[PDB]
Symmetry: C2
Subunit: 248 residues, 2 copies
Amino acid sequence: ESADLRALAKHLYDSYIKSFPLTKAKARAILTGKTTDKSPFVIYDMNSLMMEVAIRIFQGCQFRSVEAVQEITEYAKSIPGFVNLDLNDQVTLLKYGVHEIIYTMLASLMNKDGVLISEGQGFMTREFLKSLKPFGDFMEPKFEFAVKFNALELDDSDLAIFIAVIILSGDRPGLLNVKPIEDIQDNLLQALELQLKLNHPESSQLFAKLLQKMTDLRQIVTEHVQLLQVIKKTETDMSLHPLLQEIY
Amino acid sequence: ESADLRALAKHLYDSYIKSFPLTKAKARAILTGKTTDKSPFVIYDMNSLMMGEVAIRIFQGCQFRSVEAVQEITEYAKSIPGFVNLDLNDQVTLLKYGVHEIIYTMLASLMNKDGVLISEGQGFMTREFLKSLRKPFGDFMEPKFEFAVKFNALELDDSDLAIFIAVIILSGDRPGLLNVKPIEDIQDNLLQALELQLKLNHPESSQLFAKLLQKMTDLRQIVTEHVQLLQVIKKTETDMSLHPLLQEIYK
Ligand SMILES: CCCCCCCCOc1ccc(C(=O)N[C@H](C(=O)O)C(C)C)cc1
Protein backbone atom coordinates (compact mmCIF):
# COMPACT_ATOMS: atom_id res chain seq x y z
CA GLU A 1 0.00 0.00 0.00
CA SER A 2 1.22 3.47 -0.84
CA ALA A 3 -0.54 4.33 2.46
CA ASP A 4 1.77 2.78 5.05
CA LEU A 5 4.79 3.39 2.79
CA ARG A 6 4.19 7.14 2.62
CA ALA A 7 3.37 7.09 6.34
CA LEU A 8 6.65 5.31 7.14
CA ALA A 9 8.58 7.81 4.99
CA LYS A 10 7.11 10.85 6.74
CA HIS A 11 7.72 9.22 10.13
CA LEU A 12 11.39 8.79 9.30
CA TYR A 13 11.68 12.31 7.85
CA ASP A 14 10.28 13.89 11.02
CA SER A 15 12.54 11.76 13.23
CA TYR A 16 15.60 12.57 11.08
CA ILE A 17 14.81 16.28 11.47
CA LYS A 18 14.56 15.97 15.26
CA SER A 19 17.76 13.92 15.56
CA PHE A 20 20.20 15.71 13.23
CA PRO A 21 20.75 19.46 13.82
CA LEU A 22 22.50 20.38 10.54
CA THR A 23 20.18 19.21 7.75
CA LYS A 24 21.24 18.89 4.12
CA ALA A 25 18.79 21.63 3.13
CA LYS A 26 20.53 23.96 5.57
CA ALA A 27 24.07 22.90 4.63
CA ARG A 28 23.38 23.56 0.94
CA ALA A 29 21.97 27.04 1.60
CA ILE A 30 25.23 27.76 3.46
CA LEU A 31 27.55 26.09 0.91
CA THR A 32 28.18 27.01 -2.75
CA GLY A 33 24.62 28.27 -2.86
CA LYS A 34 24.81 31.07 -0.26
CA THR A 35 22.10 32.87 1.63
CA THR A 36 23.04 36.58 1.94
CA ASP A 37 22.72 36.08 5.70
CA LYS A 38 25.93 34.90 7.46
CA SER A 39 29.03 33.61 5.71
CA PRO A 40 30.96 30.88 7.55
CA PHE A 41 34.51 31.43 8.72
CA VAL A 42 36.86 29.95 6.13
CA ILE A 43 39.94 27.89 7.05
CA TYR A 44 42.25 27.82 4.03
CA ASP A 45 45.74 27.99 5.61
CA MET A 46 47.55 27.71 8.94
CA ASN A 47 47.03 31.36 9.91
CA SER A 48 43.28 31.21 9.31
CA LEU A 49 43.32 27.93 11.27
CA MET A 50 45.12 29.50 14.25
CA MET A 51 42.72 32.39 13.75
CA GLU A 52 50.56 18.73 16.05
CA VAL A 53 48.22 20.70 13.79
CA ALA A 54 47.35 17.76 11.54
CA ILE A 55 46.84 15.76 14.73
CA ARG A 56 44.54 18.27 16.35
CA ILE A 57 42.43 18.50 13.19
CA PHE A 58 42.32 14.69 13.24
CA GLN A 59 41.35 14.74 16.93
CA GLY A 60 38.64 17.33 16.28
CA CYS A 61 37.02 15.10 13.68
CA GLN A 62 37.05 12.27 16.25
CA PHE A 63 35.22 14.45 18.80
CA ARG A 64 32.61 15.28 16.14
CA SER A 65 32.15 11.67 15.04
CA VAL A 66 31.51 10.56 18.65
CA GLU A 67 28.73 13.17 18.80
CA ALA A 68 27.26 11.87 15.54
CA VAL A 69 27.21 8.29 16.88
CA GLN A 70 24.80 9.46 19.57
CA GLU A 71 22.62 11.38 17.09
CA ILE A 72 22.48 8.29 14.86
CA THR A 73 21.71 6.03 17.85
CA GLU A 74 18.65 8.07 18.80
CA TYR A 75 17.51 8.14 15.17
CA ALA A 76 17.69 4.32 14.91
CA LYS A 77 15.40 3.92 17.92
CA SER A 78 12.71 5.69 15.90
CA ILE A 79 12.83 3.12 13.07
CA PRO A 80 9.69 0.98 13.61
CA GLY A 81 10.70 -2.44 14.90
CA PHE A 82 14.32 -1.58 15.73
CA VAL A 83 13.85 -1.42 19.50
CA ASN A 84 11.91 -4.71 19.51
CA LEU A 85 15.01 -6.48 18.21
CA ASP A 86 17.33 -8.46 20.44
CA LEU A 87 19.43 -5.99 22.41
CA ASN A 88 22.74 -7.49 21.25
CA ASP A 89 21.61 -7.19 17.61
CA GLN A 90 20.71 -3.52 18.13
CA VAL A 91 24.26 -2.98 19.41
CA THR A 92 25.80 -4.95 16.52
CA LEU A 93 23.78 -3.03 13.90
CA LEU A 94 24.93 0.33 15.32
CA LYS A 95 28.57 -0.74 15.75
CA TYR A 96 28.94 -1.76 12.09
CA GLY A 97 26.48 0.72 10.65
CA VAL A 98 27.73 4.00 12.11
CA HIS A 99 30.76 4.71 9.87
CA GLU A 100 28.70 4.23 6.70
CA ILE A 101 26.12 6.70 8.02
CA ILE A 102 28.81 9.19 9.06
CA TYR A 103 30.33 9.33 5.57
CA THR A 104 26.87 9.41 3.99
CA MET A 105 25.79 12.45 5.99
CA LEU A 106 29.19 14.11 5.71
CA ALA A 107 28.58 14.32 1.95
CA SER A 108 25.66 16.63 2.76
CA LEU A 109 28.25 19.03 4.26
CA MET A 110 30.78 18.83 1.41
CA ASN A 111 31.29 20.16 -2.07
CA LYS A 112 34.27 19.68 -4.40
CA ASP A 113 36.07 22.58 -2.59
CA GLY A 114 35.53 21.89 1.12
CA VAL A 115 33.46 20.73 4.08
CA LEU A 116 31.37 22.63 6.63
CA ILE A 117 32.65 22.26 10.21
CA SER A 118 31.31 23.22 13.63
CA GLU A 119 27.58 23.13 12.91
CA GLY A 120 28.10 25.13 9.75
CA GLN A 121 29.86 28.08 11.37
CA GLY A 122 33.09 27.09 9.59
CA PHE A 123 34.35 25.88 6.22
CA MET A 124 37.65 24.04 5.87
CA THR A 125 38.88 23.98 2.29
CA ARG A 126 39.62 20.72 0.52
CA GLU A 127 43.02 22.14 -0.44
CA PHE A 128 44.07 22.92 3.11
CA LEU A 129 43.23 19.29 4.02
CA LYS A 130 45.40 17.71 1.29
CA SER A 131 48.36 19.82 2.52
CA LEU A 132 48.93 17.70 5.67
CA LYS A 133 51.33 14.86 6.66
CA PRO A 134 50.01 11.21 6.71
CA PHE A 135 46.75 13.05 7.51
CA GLY A 136 46.44 14.54 4.03
CA ASP A 137 45.08 11.21 2.81
CA PHE A 138 42.09 10.98 5.17
CA MET A 139 39.56 13.39 3.71
CA GLU A 140 40.44 13.18 -0.02
CA PRO A 141 38.66 9.80 -0.58
CA LYS A 142 35.61 11.17 1.24
CA PHE A 143 35.61 14.26 -1.02
CA GLU A 144 35.80 11.97 -4.05
CA PHE A 145 32.92 9.89 -2.73
CA ALA A 146 30.92 12.99 -1.73
CA VAL A 147 31.24 14.53 -5.21
CA LYS A 148 29.79 11.47 -6.90
CA PHE A 149 27.17 10.87 -4.18
CA ASN A 150 25.88 14.45 -4.22
CA ALA A 151 25.40 14.21 -8.00
CA LEU A 152 22.33 12.12 -7.13
CA GLU A 153 20.73 15.32 -5.69
CA LEU A 154 19.02 13.50 -2.83
CA ASP A 155 17.29 15.58 -0.19
CA ASP A 156 16.70 15.02 3.53
CA SER A 157 13.45 13.11 2.97
CA ASP A 158 15.33 10.67 0.69
CA LEU A 159 18.37 10.36 2.98
CA ALA A 160 16.19 9.64 6.04
CA ILE A 161 15.00 6.35 4.50
CA PHE A 162 18.37 5.47 2.99
CA ILE A 163 20.07 5.87 6.39
CA ALA A 164 17.54 3.46 7.93
CA VAL A 165 18.19 0.90 5.15
CA ILE A 166 21.91 1.03 6.03
CA ILE A 167 21.23 0.50 9.74
CA LEU A 168 19.04 -2.60 9.20
CA SER A 169 21.57 -4.31 6.97
CA GLY A 170 21.28 -7.97 7.96
CA ASP A 171 24.78 -9.13 7.05
CA ARG A 172 26.63 -7.58 9.98
CA PRO A 173 28.91 -10.15 11.66
CA GLY A 174 27.64 -11.75 14.83
CA LEU A 175 23.91 -11.04 14.53
CA LEU A 176 21.66 -13.54 16.37
CA ASN A 177 18.22 -13.20 14.68
CA VAL A 178 18.72 -12.04 11.07
CA LYS A 179 15.09 -12.51 10.04
CA PRO A 180 13.33 -9.54 11.71
CA ILE A 181 16.22 -7.32 10.59
CA GLU A 182 15.86 -8.26 6.92
CA ASP A 183 12.08 -8.07 7.36
CA ILE A 184 12.34 -4.45 8.49
CA GLN A 185 14.90 -3.59 5.79
CA ASP A 186 12.64 -5.11 3.11
CA ASN A 187 9.89 -2.73 4.16
CA LEU A 188 12.34 0.20 4.33
CA LEU A 189 13.54 -0.63 0.82
CA GLN A 190 9.95 -0.52 -0.41
CA ALA A 191 9.44 2.87 1.20
CA LEU A 192 12.67 4.15 -0.33
CA GLU A 193 11.71 3.05 -3.86
CA LEU A 194 8.30 4.73 -3.73
CA GLN A 195 9.89 7.82 -2.17
CA LEU A 196 12.42 8.16 -4.98
CA LYS A 197 9.80 7.54 -7.69
CA LEU A 198 7.50 10.29 -6.38
CA ASN A 199 10.21 12.71 -5.27
CA HIS A 200 12.33 12.32 -8.45
CA PRO A 201 9.88 11.19 -11.18
CA GLU A 202 12.30 12.02 -14.02
CA SER A 203 15.35 10.37 -12.37
CA SER A 204 15.43 6.98 -14.04
CA GLN A 205 16.64 4.03 -11.96
CA LEU A 206 17.73 6.31 -9.11
CA PHE A 207 16.80 3.60 -6.58
CA ALA A 208 19.20 1.18 -8.26
CA LYS A 209 21.96 3.82 -8.45
CA LEU A 210 21.58 4.71 -4.77
CA LEU A 211 21.90 1.04 -3.78
CA GLN A 212 25.07 0.80 -5.87
CA LYS A 213 26.57 3.54 -3.69
CA MET A 214 26.69 1.19 -0.68
CA THR A 215 29.57 -0.45 -2.58
CA ASP A 216 31.68 2.70 -2.50
CA LEU A 217 30.54 3.36 1.07
CA ARG A 218 31.80 0.01 2.44
CA GLN A 219 35.04 0.42 0.48
CA ILE A 220 35.45 3.91 1.96
CA VAL A 221 34.94 2.51 5.48
CA THR A 222 37.26 -0.46 4.88
CA GLU A 223 39.87 2.01 3.60
CA HIS A 224 39.38 4.40 6.53
CA VAL A 225 40.11 1.79 9.21
CA GLN A 226 43.38 0.71 7.59
CA LEU A 227 44.67 4.29 7.65
CA LEU A 228 43.49 4.47 11.26
CA GLN A 229 45.94 1.79 12.39
CA VAL A 230 48.70 3.27 10.23
CA ILE A 231 48.74 6.27 12.60
CA LYS A 232 48.80 3.96 15.64
CA LYS A 233 52.39 3.77 14.42
CA THR A 234 52.94 7.56 14.42
CA GLU A 235 51.14 8.52 17.64
CA THR A 236 51.99 5.91 20.24
CA ASP A 237 52.89 6.80 23.81
CA MET A 238 52.70 8.81 27.08
CA SER A 239 49.92 8.74 29.64
CA LEU A 240 48.26 12.19 29.90
CA HIS A 241 45.63 10.89 27.42
CA PRO A 242 43.65 9.69 30.46
CA LEU A 243 40.01 8.76 29.97
CA LEU A 244 40.46 10.59 26.65
CA GLN A 245 41.41 7.59 24.52
CA GLU A 246 38.91 5.66 26.61
CA ILE A 247 36.12 7.92 25.29
CA TYR A 248 37.42 7.31 21.73
CA GLU B 1 7.47 0.21 -23.21
CA SER B 2 7.84 -2.97 -21.20
CA ALA B 3 7.83 -4.89 -24.51
CA ASP B 4 11.25 -3.49 -25.43
CA LEU B 5 12.63 -4.58 -22.04
CA ARG B 6 11.47 -8.20 -22.53
CA ALA B 7 13.12 -8.30 -25.95
CA LEU B 8 16.32 -7.00 -24.37
CA ALA B 9 16.12 -9.72 -21.69
CA LYS B 10 15.47 -12.36 -24.36
CA HIS B 11 18.40 -11.15 -26.49
CA LEU B 12 20.82 -11.23 -23.56
CA TYR B 13 19.73 -14.70 -22.35
CA ASP B 14 20.19 -15.99 -25.91
CA SER B 15 23.76 -14.62 -26.12
CA TYR B 16 24.51 -15.98 -22.65
CA ILE B 17 23.57 -19.53 -23.76
CA LYS B 18 25.79 -19.08 -26.82
CA SER B 19 28.82 -17.72 -24.90
CA PHE B 20 28.92 -19.90 -21.76
CA PRO B 21 29.12 -23.71 -22.28
CA LEU B 22 28.26 -24.64 -18.65
CA THR B 23 25.00 -22.99 -17.60
CA LYS B 24 23.61 -22.97 -14.07
CA ALA B 25 20.79 -25.19 -15.32
CA LYS B 26 23.30 -27.84 -16.36
CA ALA B 27 25.40 -27.38 -13.22
CA ARG B 28 22.37 -27.88 -10.95
CA ALA B 29 21.29 -30.99 -12.88
CA ILE B 30 24.75 -32.48 -12.37
CA LEU B 31 25.00 -31.47 -8.70
CA THR B 32 21.56 -32.61 -7.59
CA GLY B 33 20.12 -36.08 -8.07
CA LYS B 34 18.66 -35.73 -11.55
CA THR B 35 20.67 -37.02 -14.50
CA THR B 36 23.04 -39.85 -13.69
CA ASP B 37 24.78 -39.82 -17.04
CA LYS B 38 26.00 -36.47 -15.73
CA SER B 39 27.34 -37.81 -12.39
CA PRO B 40 30.80 -36.32 -11.64
CA PHE B 41 33.91 -38.02 -10.34
CA VAL B 42 34.64 -36.65 -6.87
CA ILE B 43 38.05 -35.34 -5.72
CA TYR B 44 38.36 -35.12 -1.96
CA ASP B 45 41.96 -36.16 -1.28
CA MET B 46 45.34 -36.88 -2.84
CA ASN B 47 44.57 -40.35 -4.12
CA SER B 48 41.19 -39.55 -5.65
CA LEU B 49 42.93 -36.57 -7.27
CA MET B 50 45.76 -38.88 -8.35
CA MET B 51 42.98 -41.07 -9.82
CA GLY B 52 41.27 -38.14 -11.57
CA GLU B 53 53.45 -29.34 -6.29
CA VAL B 54 49.77 -30.35 -6.05
CA ALA B 55 48.61 -27.00 -4.67
CA ILE B 56 50.36 -25.31 -7.57
CA ARG B 57 49.05 -27.78 -10.13
CA ILE B 58 45.54 -26.98 -8.94
CA PHE B 59 46.41 -23.27 -9.11
CA GLN B 60 47.70 -23.45 -12.68
CA GLY B 61 44.49 -25.35 -13.41
CA CYS B 62 42.43 -22.47 -12.01
CA GLN B 63 44.54 -19.97 -13.99
CA PHE B 64 43.79 -21.68 -17.32
CA ARG B 65 40.05 -21.84 -16.59
CA SER B 66 40.17 -18.15 -15.67
CA VAL B 67 41.77 -17.23 -19.00
CA GLU B 68 39.11 -19.34 -20.72
CA ALA B 69 36.44 -17.46 -18.76
CA VAL B 70 37.77 -14.05 -19.82
CA GLN B 71 37.46 -15.11 -23.46
CA GLU B 72 33.87 -16.24 -22.84
CA ILE B 73 32.97 -13.05 -20.93
CA THR B 74 34.59 -10.96 -23.66
CA GLU B 75 32.47 -12.75 -26.27
CA TYR B 76 29.32 -12.08 -24.20
CA ALA B 77 30.20 -8.39 -23.70
CA LYS B 78 30.28 -7.67 -27.44
CA SER B 79 26.66 -8.89 -27.65
CA ILE B 80 25.53 -6.23 -25.13
CA PRO B 81 23.81 -3.54 -27.26
CA GLY B 82 25.96 -0.43 -27.55
CA PHE B 83 29.05 -1.98 -25.95
CA VAL B 84 31.13 -2.28 -29.13
CA ASN B 85 30.10 1.28 -30.13
CA LEU B 86 31.77 2.81 -27.15
CA ASP B 87 35.24 4.21 -27.06
CA LEU B 88 37.87 1.57 -27.11
CA ASN B 89 39.94 2.33 -23.99
CA ASP B 90 36.65 2.23 -22.13
CA GLN B 91 35.63 -1.19 -23.56
CA VAL B 92 39.02 -2.42 -22.33
CA THR B 93 38.60 -0.65 -18.97
CA LEU B 94 35.12 -2.09 -18.51
CA LEU B 95 36.43 -5.59 -19.18
CA LYS B 96 39.50 -5.14 -16.97
CA TYR B 97 37.35 -4.33 -13.94
CA GLY B 98 34.26 -6.38 -14.73
CA VAL B 99 35.79 -9.75 -15.55
CA HIS B 100 36.49 -11.07 -12.06
CA GLU B 101 33.23 -9.84 -10.55
CA ILE B 102 31.51 -11.87 -13.26
CA ILE B 103 33.73 -14.94 -12.80
CA TYR B 104 32.86 -15.14 -9.09
CA THR B 105 29.15 -14.55 -9.81
CA MET B 106 29.05 -17.40 -12.31
CA LEU B 107 31.31 -19.65 -10.21
CA ALA B 108 28.52 -19.75 -7.62
CA SER B 109 26.36 -21.65 -10.15
CA LEU B 110 29.01 -24.38 -10.05
CA MET B 111 29.15 -24.52 -6.22
CA ASN B 112 27.23 -25.85 -3.25
CA LYS B 113 28.33 -25.88 0.38
CA ASP B 114 30.42 -29.07 -0.18
CA GLY B 115 32.48 -28.31 -3.31
CA VAL B 116 32.70 -27.11 -6.90
CA LEU B 117 32.28 -28.61 -10.37
CA ILE B 118 35.45 -28.76 -12.49
CA SER B 119 36.48 -29.78 -15.99
CA GLU B 120 33.15 -28.67 -17.49
CA GLY B 121 31.19 -30.66 -14.93
CA GLN B 122 32.99 -34.02 -15.26
CA GLY B 123 34.61 -33.59 -11.85
CA PHE B 124 33.70 -32.31 -8.41
CA MET B 125 36.44 -31.02 -6.11
CA THR B 126 35.53 -30.96 -2.41
CA ARG B 127 35.58 -27.70 -0.42
CA GLU B 128 37.52 -29.34 2.43
CA PHE B 129 40.16 -30.69 0.05
CA LEU B 130 40.74 -27.18 -1.34
CA LYS B 131 41.08 -25.76 2.20
CA SER B 132 43.59 -28.41 3.19
CA LEU B 133 46.01 -27.23 0.49
CA ARG B 134 49.40 -25.82 1.53
CA LYS B 135 49.22 -22.45 3.20
CA PRO B 136 48.76 -19.66 0.77
CA PHE B 137 46.65 -21.85 -1.54
CA GLY B 138 44.29 -23.25 1.09
CA ASP B 139 42.91 -19.72 1.38
CA PHE B 140 42.02 -19.02 -2.25
CA MET B 141 38.66 -20.70 -2.70
CA GLU B 142 37.13 -20.41 0.78
CA PRO B 143 35.76 -16.82 0.52
CA LYS B 144 34.37 -17.82 -2.91
CA PHE B 145 32.39 -20.67 -1.30
CA GLU B 146 31.18 -18.31 1.44
CA PHE B 147 29.90 -15.90 -1.19
CA ALA B 148 28.30 -18.65 -3.24
CA VAL B 149 26.23 -20.10 -0.38
CA LYS B 150 24.63 -16.69 0.24
CA PHE B 151 24.33 -15.77 -3.44
CA ASN B 152 22.78 -19.15 -4.32
CA ALA B 153 20.10 -18.46 -1.69
CA LEU B 154 18.69 -15.82 -4.06
CA GLU B 155 17.71 -18.76 -6.37
CA LEU B 156 18.56 -16.96 -9.62
CA ASP B 157 18.44 -18.82 -12.91
CA ASP B 158 20.39 -18.21 -16.10
CA SER B 159 17.87 -15.73 -17.55
CA ASP B 160 18.22 -13.58 -14.42
CA LEU B 161 22.02 -13.88 -14.39
CA ALA B 162 22.36 -12.96 -18.07
CA ILE B 163 20.99 -9.47 -17.35
CA PHE B 164 22.85 -9.14 -14.05
CA ILE B 165 26.19 -9.97 -15.70
CA ALA B 166 25.52 -7.21 -18.26
CA VAL B 167 24.69 -4.70 -15.49
CA ILE B 168 28.09 -5.50 -13.94
CA ILE B 169 30.04 -4.91 -17.17
CA LEU B 170 28.43 -1.53 -17.93
CA SER B 171 29.29 0.16 -14.66
CA GLY B 172 30.74 3.59 -15.30
CA ASP B 173 32.29 4.02 -11.86
CA ARG B 174 35.30 2.14 -13.23
CA PRO B 175 38.67 3.90 -12.68
CA GLY B 176 39.91 5.78 -15.74
CA LEU B 177 36.83 5.86 -17.98
CA LEU B 178 36.75 8.58 -20.64
CA ASN B 179 33.02 8.95 -21.50
CA VAL B 180 30.93 7.88 -18.52
CA LYS B 181 27.54 9.08 -19.80
CA PRO B 182 27.04 6.60 -22.71
CA ILE B 183 28.01 3.82 -20.28
CA GLU B 184 25.46 4.94 -17.69
CA ASP B 185 22.81 5.26 -20.41
CA ILE B 186 23.28 1.58 -21.31
CA GLN B 187 23.38 0.46 -17.67
CA ASP B 188 20.18 2.37 -16.96
CA ASN B 189 18.43 0.42 -19.72
CA LEU B 190 19.89 -2.85 -18.44
CA LEU B 191 18.75 -2.02 -14.89
CA GLN B 192 15.17 -1.51 -16.10
CA ALA B 193 15.43 -4.84 -17.89
CA LEU B 194 16.78 -6.61 -14.78
CA GLU B 195 14.07 -5.03 -12.62
CA LEU B 196 11.25 -6.21 -14.88
CA GLN B 197 12.78 -9.69 -15.28
CA LEU B 198 13.01 -10.31 -11.52
CA LYS B 199 9.44 -9.08 -10.97
CA LEU B 200 8.12 -11.50 -13.61
CA ASN B 201 10.36 -14.49 -12.88
CA HIS B 202 10.25 -14.22 -9.06
CA PRO B 203 6.84 -12.66 -8.32
CA GLU B 204 6.62 -13.85 -4.71
CA SER B 205 10.19 -12.69 -3.98
CA SER B 206 10.10 -9.37 -2.13
CA GLN B 207 12.76 -6.77 -3.11
CA LEU B 208 14.93 -9.31 -4.96
CA PHE B 209 16.16 -6.49 -7.21
CA ALA B 210 17.48 -4.52 -4.22
CA LYS B 211 18.92 -7.68 -2.61
CA LEU B 212 20.70 -8.72 -5.80
CA LEU B 213 22.23 -5.24 -6.27
CA GLN B 214 23.44 -5.25 -2.65
CA LYS B 215 25.38 -8.42 -3.55
CA MET B 216 27.64 -6.33 -5.78
CA THR B 217 29.33 -5.25 -2.53
CA ASP B 218 30.34 -8.80 -1.61
CA LEU B 219 31.80 -9.33 -5.09
CA ARG B 220 33.95 -6.21 -4.84
CA GLN B 221 35.31 -7.40 -1.47
CA ILE B 222 36.14 -10.87 -2.82
CA VAL B 223 38.17 -9.44 -5.71
CA THR B 224 39.97 -7.07 -3.32
CA GLU B 225 40.70 -10.00 -0.99
CA HIS B 226 41.81 -12.15 -3.95
CA VAL B 227 44.20 -9.48 -5.23
CA GLN B 228 45.83 -9.32 -1.80
CA LEU B 229 46.27 -13.09 -1.83
CA LEU B 230 47.97 -13.02 -5.25
CA GLN B 231 50.56 -10.50 -4.01
CA VAL B 232 51.55 -13.08 -1.34
CA ILE B 233 51.99 -15.79 -4.00
CA LYS B 234 54.20 -13.67 -6.27
CA LYS B 235 56.71 -13.38 -3.41
CA THR B 236 56.60 -16.90 -1.94
CA GLU B 237 56.45 -18.66 -5.34
CA THR B 238 59.14 -17.03 -7.49
CA ASP B 239 59.28 -20.12 -9.73
CA MET B 240 55.59 -19.74 -10.63
CA SER B 241 54.14 -18.01 -13.66
CA LEU B 242 50.95 -15.98 -13.74
CA HIS B 243 49.25 -15.86 -17.13
CA PRO B 244 49.90 -12.72 -19.24
CA LEU B 245 46.21 -11.97 -19.82
CA LEU B 246 45.70 -12.21 -16.04
CA GLN B 247 48.81 -10.12 -15.38
CA GLU B 248 47.49 -7.27 -17.54
CA ILE B 249 44.03 -7.40 -15.92
CA TYR B 250 45.68 -6.95 -12.50
CA LYS B 251 47.61 -3.75 -11.81
C1 LIG C 1 35.31 -25.76 -15.77
C2 LIG C 1 36.57 -26.34 -16.40
C3 LIG C 1 37.82 -26.12 -15.55
C4 LIG C 1 37.61 -26.49 -14.10
C5 LIG C 1 38.48 -25.70 -13.12
C6 LIG C 1 37.67 -25.29 -11.90
C7 LIG C 1 38.44 -24.54 -10.84
C8 LIG C 1 37.57 -23.52 -10.12
O1 LIG C 1 37.29 -22.42 -10.99
C9 LIG C 1 38.06 -21.25 -10.74
C10 LIG C 1 38.78 -21.12 -9.56
C11 LIG C 1 39.54 -19.98 -9.32
C12 LIG C 1 39.59 -18.93 -10.25
C13 LIG C 1 40.45 -17.71 -9.93
O2 LIG C 1 40.18 -16.94 -9.01
N1 LIG C 1 41.65 -17.47 -10.67
C14 LIG C 1 42.44 -16.35 -10.29
C15 LIG C 1 42.21 -15.10 -11.12
O3 LIG C 1 42.05 -15.12 -12.36
O4 LIG C 1 42.17 -13.99 -10.52
C16 LIG C 1 43.91 -16.74 -10.33
C17 LIG C 1 44.12 -18.03 -11.09
C18 LIG C 1 44.82 -15.63 -10.83
C19 LIG C 1 38.86 -19.06 -11.43
C20 LIG C 1 38.10 -20.21 -11.68
